[PDB]
Design a protein around this nucleic acid. Structure first.
Ligand SMILES: O=[N+]([O-])c1ccc2c(ccn2[C@H]2C[C@H](O)[C@@H](COP(=O)(O)OP(=O)(O)OP(=O)(O)O)O2)c1
Ligand SMILES: [Mg+2]
Length: 903
DNA sequence: CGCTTATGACAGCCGCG
DNA sequence: GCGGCTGTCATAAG
């Protein structure tokens, strides 16, 4: 196999690398790296090296990296450009591995761990680490074993060993329900003193040193605490044994209240799963506790225990240890579904960066671009400093608030990257400028053609057509990858819908799930072989089909992020290729393209229809058009379709067979007009929306910008057995809405779109008749706790103090004194509830840490003073009234004046 | 060491016989 | 003591 790296670091004058060798063994190196930077030199000098603008450079070899950095600052102390790759880690990798990296994951040691700390006086701060570590579970990627480190004796009590035979039993038999799949993979190790325990962990750590270190919340807790606990007991020197090269950096990002520690272990790449999730899940959550994410992702109930967590070790040591084991396991199960560690590995090696740099789009692209240039012997510019400056972005159409019965939508495929490609926008391909007309002229085809020789954006920039730019080229690679994985995702989605209507009646039979790849459309044979399978066999395939969709979704949506992030970096001041002439060339172009095709669509439909001046496009956001399909149905008359599924097929045909050909013509005209390299504006048909036939439902509605709802029958080719609701921007999609109100409002919209006026009023009445009965958590709002300190003012609301922050302050007053009570942490999410006049807390609202239940200290008082009437009014009634007004419905029953002749 | 556009819940202030 | 507006903040749609 080819050689590949693990972790690279720079410690002084040397580079420390871990890597896999010729055969597959892990090694280490200390390379006194001699780097090469560049300087501009006279044209008269013959050379091999040129920068991106063509101007000639001379290479400078350095004795060491320390002299190399000295030279750079000396070059700016004088005012001359210091060219080349200033991050020597990246250059060193580029030198050593001057080829495309293939890697074997079975060789990479990925470690998942979690620790436990008993603490009778509140949450144990990693800074101090004053309380003892009584348990650690440590999963090893290569051994495939769960290493358990128990502690039997502690100043907070002494306990007998943990039983593997009891942990395996169901919780209904008084066991723990540690899953069977791992019962044979646990390695148990009891310890009689903490020193003995921690001492063993490090020797263990030494023989099995993690390359990739993951786990739940390990950056903020586990790592700092095992580092600091060891520090307090064995001294700072012994702690450094956590780092393969014995170097660690400590970062005290101390809050306005308490301390906060971030340790950096050199030679290890830490990827906290909480961070991976936040970056790659594309889901804003009300809580980020492991129990919450597990329930959400896996449908597995919480790890139940009696009494306070602090005394769980004392009360029930068996459960304690078992729950530590399961906690590590859940992260593994989530990852098995989300593929975030795999995703991180692909990107990190593709760009030749430190794996933990996957979180930075600026770094990832800087490297990709850097390497791409290096192979053509090109020299990269110096990273200048720039002042932060707002610049114009996309165009969003102002829609007339209303209902819309039949709607059809179209969306441009990676609009911003395609603009980059079409127009050939790159730092070194800048040709010149032209004098700009008002954008409407360009939209209306009125303005004079900008150039007949270069590639033009309506912001006044010109580009060469003759060559290829690094940006357009490198962006096309990741885009093609994204296009691939989107095809599988859409396939398994289409596949799933075939399995989903196939359990409208499964055969009573005993068989086995078919052996197929869900990444592809089922062939006519297997399509026919499906409905011949059983419920138990279909529920298995359905689940697998969705597993592959989930995994394909991950792969696609994140490649889409990275390519949109290249445009983003162009508009970021720390990016080497920061250039607002390029950033605005993109957005201005998009503003034009969207409005151009709006005009053009309104034309082809006026003609095809017969009428004149009709606005068919009701809405648009950035690169999307929403088309009023009503008048196109009128031509065929309302009643001429046997069932719902007929007007969907018809419209899908009218779109693909008629509209898209018209669109494709409309854009190449724009292409000619802007004289671009290659026509790359393709509109993919998205949604088909409307009510069921013979139903009083309304189909869809808009309330404003970014806020609308639609009843969708086909999304991007995928035909649904059951119609799904496309809901955007409304409260049902916000993580700040209470969970019960999310569901209730989703039901109101479904009854509005699919069934009609009457159906709505029925659900409204019953819900508010039952609202008082719901679990308080399910009807609490959610907000994030930012800048608590700013409005603190002795524990009372200061000037301009936000509502949720107010709730936080009133919470802190009530719990003051009792140090065991859960503290509210800066930056984290909180539950918020309104309070009734003259309550014991002496303020109008309370807030506590989210994902949790409130402490028995105040729990009953607050539950007892909850303001159900305000809660229902603001979280539920106002939003509904919002939807209703736009839909022009009632949800109630107004002054009938029929009231008199009732009965 | 590292994107803009937009809505809504609130605070605060202002006019209002 | 309520609506209109501006600004801060949380959070969505791209
Ligand atoms: O820096 N960012 O993080 C960033 C920058 C720009 C971004 C986005 C998210 C969207 N855009 C811009 C650039 C996109 O091309 C355009 C429209 O987005 P979209 O949701 O329609 O998806 P596309 O990127 O067009 O691709 P798709 O339509 O095939 O999904 O809106 C994110
Ligand atoms: Mg798009």
């Amino acid at each position: 196999m080819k050689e590949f790296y693990l972790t690279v670091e720079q410690i002084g004058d040397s580079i420390f690398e871990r890597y896999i060798d010729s055969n597959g063994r892990e090694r280490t190196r200390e390379v006194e790296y001699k780097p090469s930077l560049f300087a501009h030199c006279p044209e008269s000098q013959a050379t091999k090296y040129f920068d991106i603008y063509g101007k000639p450079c001379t290479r400078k070899l350095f004795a060491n990296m320390r002299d190399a950095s000295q030279w750079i600052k000396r070059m700016e102390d004088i005012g001359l450009e210091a060219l080349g790759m200033d991050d020597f880690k990246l250059a060193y990798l580029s030198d050593t591995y001057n080829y495309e990296i293939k890697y074997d994951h079975t060789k990479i040691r990925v470690a998942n761990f979690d620790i436990e700390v008993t603490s009778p006086d509140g949450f144990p701060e990693p800074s101090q680490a004053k309380h003892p570590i009584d348990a650690i579970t440590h999963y090893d990627s290569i051994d495939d074993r769960f290493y358990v480190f128990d502690l039997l004796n502690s100043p907070y009590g002494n306990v007998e060993e943990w039983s593997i035979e009891i942990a395996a039993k169901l919780q209904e038999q008084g066991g723990d329900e540690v899953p069977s799949e791992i019962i044979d993979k646990i390695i148990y190790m009891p310890f009689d003193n903490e020193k003995e325990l921690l001492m063993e962990y490090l020797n263990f750590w030494q023989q099995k040193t993690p390359v990739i270190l993951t786990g739940w919340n390990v950056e903020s807790f586990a790592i700092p605490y095992v580092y600091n606990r060891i520090k307090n007991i064995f001294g700072e020197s012994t702690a450094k044994r956590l780092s393969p090269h014995r170097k660690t950096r400590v970062k005290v990002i101390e809050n306005m209240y308490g301390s906060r520690e971030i340790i950096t272990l050199f030679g290890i790449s830490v990827l906290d799963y909480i961070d991976l999730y936040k970056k790659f899940s594309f889901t804003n959550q009300p809580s980020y506790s492991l129990d919450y994410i597990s329930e959400f992702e896996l449908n597995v109930g919480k790890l139940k225990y009696d009494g306070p967590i602090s005394k769980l070790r004392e009360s029930n040591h068996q459960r304690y240890i078992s729950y530590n084991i399961i906690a590590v396991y859940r992260v593994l199960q989530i990852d098995a579904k989300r593929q975030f560690i795999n995703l991180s590995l692909d990107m990190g090696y593709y760009a030749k960066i430190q794996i933990q740099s996957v979180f930075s789009p600026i770094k990832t692209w800087d490297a990709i671009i850097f390497n791409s240039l290096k192979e053509q012997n090109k020299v990269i510019p110096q990273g200048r400093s720039h002042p932060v400056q707002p610049y114009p972005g996309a165009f969003v159409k102002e829609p007339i608030p209303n209902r819309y019965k039949y709607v059809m939508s179209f969306d441009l495929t990676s609009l911003y990257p395609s603009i980059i490609r079409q127009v050939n926008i790159s730092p070194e391909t800048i040709a010149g400028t032209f004098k700009v007309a008002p954008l409407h002229d360009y939209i209306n085809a009125v303005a004079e053609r900008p150039s007949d020789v270069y590639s033009c954006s309506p912001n006044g920039m010109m580009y060469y057509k003759d060559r290829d730019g690094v940006v357009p080229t490198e962006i096309t690679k990741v885009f093609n990858q994204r296009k691939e994985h989107k095809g599988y995702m859409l396939a398994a989605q289409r596949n799933g819908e075939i399995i989903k209507e196939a359990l409208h009646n499964p055969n009573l039979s005993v068989d086995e799930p078919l052996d197929v790849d869900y990444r592809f459309d089922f062939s006519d044979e297997i399509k026919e072989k499906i409905k011949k399978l059983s419920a138990k066999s279909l529920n298995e395939m359905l689940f697998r089909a969705q597993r592959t969709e989930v995994a394909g979704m991950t792969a696609q949506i994140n490649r889409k992020l990275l390519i949109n992030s290249l445009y983003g970096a162009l508009g970021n001041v720390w990016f080497r290729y920061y250039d607002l002439r390029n950033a605005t060339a993109i957005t201005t172009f998009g503003q034009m393209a969207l409005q151009w095709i709006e005009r053009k669509v309104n034309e082809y439909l006026n003609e095809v229809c017969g009428t004149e001046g009709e606005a068919f496009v009701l809405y648009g956001d950035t690169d999307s058009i929403y088309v009023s399909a009503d008048k196109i149905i009128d031509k065929v008359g309302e009643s001429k379709f046997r069932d719902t599924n007929h007007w969907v097929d018809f419209l899908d045909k009218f779109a693909r067979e008629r509209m898209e050909p018209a669109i494709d013509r409309g854009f190449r005209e724009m292409c000619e007009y802007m004289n671009n390299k290659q026509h790359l504006m393709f509109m993919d048909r998205e949604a088909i929306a409307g009510p069921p036939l013979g139903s009083k439902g309304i189909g869809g509605f808009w309330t404003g910008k970014k806020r609308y709802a639609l009843n969708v029958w086909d999304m991007e080719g995928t035909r649904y057995a059951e119609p799904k609701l496309k809901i955007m921007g409304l409260e049902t999609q916000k993580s700040s809405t209470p969970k019960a109100v999310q569901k209730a409002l989703k039901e109101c919209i479904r009854r509005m779109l699919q069934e009609g006026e009457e159906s709505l009023q029925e659900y409204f009445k019953e819900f508010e008749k039952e609202f008082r009965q719901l679990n308080y958590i399910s009807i609490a709002s959610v907000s994030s706790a930012n800048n608590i300190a700013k409005y603190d003012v002795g524990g009372f609301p200061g000037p301009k103090c936000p509502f949720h922050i107010r709730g936080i302050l009133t919470y802190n007053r009530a719990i003051k004194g009792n140090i065991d009570a859960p503290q509210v942490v800066e930056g984290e999410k909180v539950y918020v509830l309104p309070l009734r006049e003259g309550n014991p807390f002496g303020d109008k609202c309370i807030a506590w840490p989210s994902g949790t239940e409130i402490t028995d200290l105040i729990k009953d008082d607050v539950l007892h003073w909850m303001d159900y009437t305000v809660l229902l009014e603001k979280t539920f009634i106002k939003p509904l009234e919002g939807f209703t007004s736009a839909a022009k419905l009632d949800y109630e029953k107004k002054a009938s004046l029929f009231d008199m002749f009732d009965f």
